[PDB]
Design goal:
2 domains, mainly beta, Trefoil (Acidic Fibroblast Growth Factor, subunit A), eleven-stranded antiparallel beta sheet, Jelly Rolls, nine-stranded antiparallel beta sheet, 2 helices, 419 residues, 31 strands
Length: 419
Amino acid sequence: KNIVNTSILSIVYKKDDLIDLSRYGAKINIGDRVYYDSIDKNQIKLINLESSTIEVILKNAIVYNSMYENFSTSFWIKIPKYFSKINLNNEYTIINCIENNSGWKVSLNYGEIIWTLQDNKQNIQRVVFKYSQMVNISDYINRWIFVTITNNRLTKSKIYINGRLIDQKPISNLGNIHASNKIMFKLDGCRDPRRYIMIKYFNLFDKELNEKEIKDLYDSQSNSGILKDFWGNYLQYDKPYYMLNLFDPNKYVDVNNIGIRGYMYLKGPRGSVVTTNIYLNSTLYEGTKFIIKKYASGNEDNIVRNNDRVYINVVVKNKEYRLATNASQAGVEKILSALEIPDVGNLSQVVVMKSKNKCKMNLQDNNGNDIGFIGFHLYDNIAKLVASNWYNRQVGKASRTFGCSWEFIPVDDGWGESS
């Protein structure tokens, strides 16, 4: 019943190959320089080499002249930060269904995801998503984005980003769009040899998806049982993460002293990384690193899941300490401390990991009672990290709750700031 089942092409990883999950069984030819993420094999990396290619041949049986009258494409994409002036004014095709100068393609440029419909009279229409590299904290740079492009020959071509309309151009003026049976995924025309993309869950639909169908597609493909890091990859155990509190993203976490008389606090503003005319962003690699440690998970995999019960380690001067509190302290607000792992004793330290990318951490006492979601509280102009059941009540008493949602930011090559 999810609209994704109606896909006429659904590229997924199985065994050691990409296959069409649709019942229409397209053929998929993979070049020698196509890579899969060791953790999430559906994450495909295409690099800037002629052998980094995925060729889809649709069955001629499903390819008909008027199929591109109503159609949508959906996929997820991770586009590394553009670092060089070579990247400016260099539109490069990534997904090509063009034959006899008619069809559709997806291209990228500096801060752009571009859709092109060409008819058989060579009239073109472009819809364009623009994202700035001149922002403190980008929702788009080097992060998994869900793209949905819908097309109705009587109305418009529309581009959606994470389920939200961004551009729309009327296409009623265009002629007939040639239906190729070939789709080529490959970097085409990119003058920067170090460029790559990552792509997952490519779908083609023989329909103009509506807003409500795009939202179900986005929500269904999110995998909300697995937590995500800032980039949108799987959250992992034993991996160091810089912390961001979504209520105040211009701050980072620091530790004031080790032990139960010490505390953790939000501090800012963030620094800045710059290449004039290319990017200006807040530094992400700032503050105390958190490491998620297995408590209730076995050594099956290192993936952190919804409702996993974990420990949190905190790195101070390349040494690990345990996030803990005394649940007995006066007041709802329990100030967190970084404790010597030997000393934690019976101090509350078990955290329930939850999805709302948007991670929550529910601290529990040693009887499995809630101490509360990890957030912060102002004590005389210091925003100290706390566990507070204030947050747990507010979730049930308000449409929204602010301050107990976090992002976990590991070092990533597509971001390229010094670690």
